[PDB]
Amino acid sequence: MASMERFLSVYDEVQAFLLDQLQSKYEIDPNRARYLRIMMDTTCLGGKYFRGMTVVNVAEGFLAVTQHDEATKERILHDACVGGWMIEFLQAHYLVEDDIMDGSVMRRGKPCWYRFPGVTTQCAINDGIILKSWTQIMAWHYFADRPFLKDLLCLFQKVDYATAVGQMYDVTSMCDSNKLDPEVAQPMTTDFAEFTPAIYKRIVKYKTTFYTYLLPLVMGLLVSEAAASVEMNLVERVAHLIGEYFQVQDDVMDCFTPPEQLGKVGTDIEDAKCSWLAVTFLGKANAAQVAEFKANYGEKDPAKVAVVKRLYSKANLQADFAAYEAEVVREVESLIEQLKVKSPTFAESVAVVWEKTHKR
Amino acid sequence: MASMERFLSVYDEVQAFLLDQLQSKYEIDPNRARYLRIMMDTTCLGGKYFRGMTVVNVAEGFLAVTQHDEATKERILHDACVGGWMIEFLQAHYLVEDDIMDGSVMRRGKPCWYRFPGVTTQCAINDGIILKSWTQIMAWHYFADRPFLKDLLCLFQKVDYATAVGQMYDVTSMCDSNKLDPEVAQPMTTDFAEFTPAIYKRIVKYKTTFYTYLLPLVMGLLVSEAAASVEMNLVERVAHLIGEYFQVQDDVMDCFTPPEQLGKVGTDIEDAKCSWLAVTFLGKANAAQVAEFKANYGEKDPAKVAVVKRLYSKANLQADFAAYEAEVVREVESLIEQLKVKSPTFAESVAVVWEKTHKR
Ligand SMILES: CCN1C(=O)CN([C@H]2[C@H](O)[C@@H]3O[C@H]2c2ccccc23)C1=O
Ligand SMILES: CCN1C(=O)CN([C@H]2[C@H](O)[C@@H]3O[C@H]2c2ccccc23)C1=O
Ligand SMILES: [Zn+2]
Ligand SMILES: [Zn+2]
Ligand SMILES: [Zn+2]
Ligand SMILES: [Zn+2]
Numbered sequence: 001m002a003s004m005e006r007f008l009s010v011y012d013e014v015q016a017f018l019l020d021q022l023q024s025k026y027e028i029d030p031n032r033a034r035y036l037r038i039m040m041d042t043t044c045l046g047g048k049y050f051r052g053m054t055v056v057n058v059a060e061g062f063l064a065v066t067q068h069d070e071a072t073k074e075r076i077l078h079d080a081c082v083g084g085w086m087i088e089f090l091q092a093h094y095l096v097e098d099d100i101m102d103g104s105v106m107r108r109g110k111p112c113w114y115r116f117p118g119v120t121t122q123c124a125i126n127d128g129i130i131l132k133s134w135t136q137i138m139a140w141h142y143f144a145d146r147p148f149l150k151d152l153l154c155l156f157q158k159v160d161y162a163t164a165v166g167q168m169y170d171v172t173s174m175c176d177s178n179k180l181d182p183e184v185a186q187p188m189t190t191d192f193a194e195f196t197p198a199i200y201k202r203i204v205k206y207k208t209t210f211y212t213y214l215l216p217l218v219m220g221l222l223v224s225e226a227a228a229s230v231e232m233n234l235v236e237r238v239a240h241l242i243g244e245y246f247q248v249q250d251d252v253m254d255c256f257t258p259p260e261q262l263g264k265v266g267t268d269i270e271d272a273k274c275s276w277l278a279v280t281f282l283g284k285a286n287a288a289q290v291a292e293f294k295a296n297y298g299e300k301d302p303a304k305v306a307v308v309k310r311l312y313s314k315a316n317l318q319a320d321f322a323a324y325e326a327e328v329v330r331e332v333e334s335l336i337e338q339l340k341v342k343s344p345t346f347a348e349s350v351a352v353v354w355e356k357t358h359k360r
Numbered sequence: 361m362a363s364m365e366r367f368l369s370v371y372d373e374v375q376a377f378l379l380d381q382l383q384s385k386y387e388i389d390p391n392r393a394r395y396l397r398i399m400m401d402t403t404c405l406g407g408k409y410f411r412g413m414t415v416v417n418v419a420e421g422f423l424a425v426t427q428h429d430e431a432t433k434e435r436i437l438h439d440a441c442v443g444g445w446m447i448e449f450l451q452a453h454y455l456v457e458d459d460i461m462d463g464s465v466m467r468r469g470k471p472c473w474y475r476f477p478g479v480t481t482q483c484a485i486n487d488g489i490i491l492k493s494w495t496q497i498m499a500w501h502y503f504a505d506r507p508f509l510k511d512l513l514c515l516f517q518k519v520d521y522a523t524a525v526g527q528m529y530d531v532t533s534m535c536d537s538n539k540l541d542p543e544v545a546q547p548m549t550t551d552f553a554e555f556t557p558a559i560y561k562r563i564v565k566y567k568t569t570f571y572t573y574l575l576p577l578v579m580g581l582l583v584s585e586a587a588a589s590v591e592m593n594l595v596e597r598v599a600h601l602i603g604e605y606f607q608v609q610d611d612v613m614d615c616f617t618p619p620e621q622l623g624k625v626g627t628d629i630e631d632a633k634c635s636w637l638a639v640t641f642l643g644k645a646n647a648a649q650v651a652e653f654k655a656n657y658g659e660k661d662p663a664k665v666a667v668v669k670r671l672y673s674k675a676n677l678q679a680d681f682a683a684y685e686a687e688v689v690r691e692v693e694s695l696i697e698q699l700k701v702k703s704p705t706f707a708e709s710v711a712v713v714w715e716k717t718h719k720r
Pocket of ligand 1: 024518519522570574592596
């Protein structure tokens with residue numbers, strides 16, 4: 001069976017299980033089960049499934065080199081699918097709540113969930129809660145007797161928490177740290193002293209890399225009982241490297257990709273986000289360019305957003321990007337090498353993960 | 361050591377642990393650690409700690425009748441405190457997000473968290489996420505090697521999920537079920553056909569009773585290794601009974617308790633909530649009273665909210681309440697009796713839980 005068709009079948013199975021359980025154990029009525037079915041589909045489906053499919057790919061890698069009964073191969077693949085969906089639903093929770101937090105309009109060329117007419121924020125916040133809750137329901141049902149249960153739950157728990165911490169670092173990235181205070185409304189930075197590479201890297205490490213790269217790779221290893229085939233410090237390193245790269249592309253696209261292809265009107269400039277573009281521009285700008293960026297950044301006004309796009313264009317950030325891209329290609333190749341000392345198989349899975357990131 | 365002083369000490373310990381971990385493992389800076397410290401304190405402290413303290417009381421019950429080394433008594437009490445705080449922080453998550461969902465203004469005579477000037481909704485939604493995440497961090501740190509770890513996590517997971525389902529039943533309680541649809545903005549019911557006792561009971565069972573009564577009682581049993589001293593079906597039954605009673609009081613107070621003593625301006629009428637008052641009033645009203653209630657319920661206008669209060673006053677709902685209260689007193693006493701067949705100790709803890717509910 002092809003990997004994707006398997007993965008999607010398991011979605012239907014998991015859906016049926018969740019909704020059936022709601023009826024038998026939580027007293028749900030048919031109409032509210034229908035609302036939750038629609039919410040699930042709308043929030044969990046329509047993407048590329050890159051994350052969930054990475055768990056399946058890693059597991060398939062190991063299957064090709066490890067002796068097992070056919071029923072065990074099936075169980076492993078079914079576990080990798082279930083695990084893949086836990087990450088997809090975790091993502092879905094974070095996109096629902098982030099979209100509400102950020103006042104976002106669209107996502108993937110469709111309205112954000114909370115904007116649907118029969119949803120509203122009042123229900124969407126709690127729908128997002130449920131999305132994450134279903135990750136735990138899945139795990140305890142399908143993995144109840146599995147040896148990896150505790151390691152999987154503890155890892156998932158830490159990556160969820162890292163993710164929420166990342167969100168905090170992202171939403172507070174335009175404030176001055178010394179001024180954070182629940183009692184006082186937060187001014188936007190005027191010095192941009194905190195728009196540095198290290199500060200950027202911390203935001204991206206936590207807000208994206210743990211759930212997008214570390215978790216799929218390590219879940220793949222856990223459902224394969226293969227964690228001893230890797231040096232976990234190397235899996236971490238490569239994950240952060242690849243994840244940082246992924247985000248830099250997303251940061252570049254928010255500004256320069258046309259909204260129809262993007263799935264979104266980009267607002268990082270107006271939101272004063274600590275993007276790769278802002279940081280890289282500040283890292284090469286002259287005094288006059290810095291003052292012009294400060295006078296225009298983080299304002300709704302289109303004339304000022306255009307001035308910021310103009311400064312980025314004239315600053316030749318394509319050069320800085322190609323240079324970054326070079327160095328990442330270099331570092332990721334070294335780490336893949338270091339990954340072959342213990343698992344050719346695993347190193348190859350990371351190679352595929354890198355190819356799918358580095359192309360898109 | 362008195363129970364409360366213990367409980368509060370452990371808060372400080374747990375806080376220190378969480379924030380120290382953020383610094384050593386999640387790269388937090390001092391200012392953001394301060395913001396999270398303040399968020400924690402503001403959202404987790406200032407209540408009566410009824411929930412968390414119930415875990416401690418149940419554990420203390422068992423300590424009085426079970427032979428243990430002193431260091432084991434301490435470990436049990438420390439575990440009951442940690443477990444108590446997991447429930448308090450779970451509550452804190454739900455109050456933060458509910459207050460945002462409902463557009464609430466005050467809670468406990470202070471502004472809701474999201475209304476603080478340096479918070480805003482953008483951060484509060486994610487602060488609420490973190491609150492729940494800290495429940496898992498606590499459990500995996502303090503209970504790592506405990507035999508009850510898996511049972512505790514699986515129970516906590518199910519009660520969290522019940523709670524979110526309860527929230528869904530509560531926020532959708534003024535809509536007609538057959539009309540729920542993410543695509544269509546939801547009209548308020550015009551028939552109030554779904555304002556029944558059974559429908560009420562389902563909302564309260566899930567939205568309140570599982571986290572407020574079932575979880576503290578059962579956590580108490582789990583940290584005591586005492587789950588075999590009870591018939592779990594009876595613990596469930598008594599929990600739902602007592603929890604339903606607790607909510608009926610809260611429903612009555614929302615309408616009739618003056619806002620300074622309440623901690624809150626009550627808006628259940630304007631919000632068209634399926635309250636005990638609405639359901640009990642509909643269960644005894646004549647045709648003209650029903651039409652007057654329909655013409656005024658679920659509107660912001662003070663004149664109409666007063667008309668609804670007037671209808672409730674003239675309808676003599678104090679009689680229905682005393683009758684309900686009677687029957688609950690009766691049923692809870694029977695269940696406590698049925699609880700003594702296996703644990704006098706546990707039945708007594710439930711007796712205390714009932715006395716603290718039935719008085720306030
Ligand atoms: C502790 C014993 N107990 C209950 O009190 C409820 N019950 C089951 C309910 O149908 C649903 O699944 C289980 C569960 C646990 C917590 C919340 C919701 C649920 C159960 O096992
Ligand atoms: C899987 C191996 N691994 C990591 O990649 C990161 N690391 C630790 C980090 O300091 C923090 O605690 C642990 C953890 C797990 C997930 C997210 C965040 C954290 C760790 O053990
Ligand atoms: Zn965001
Ligand atoms: Zn972006
Ligand atoms: Zn509410
Ligand atoms: Zn209330």
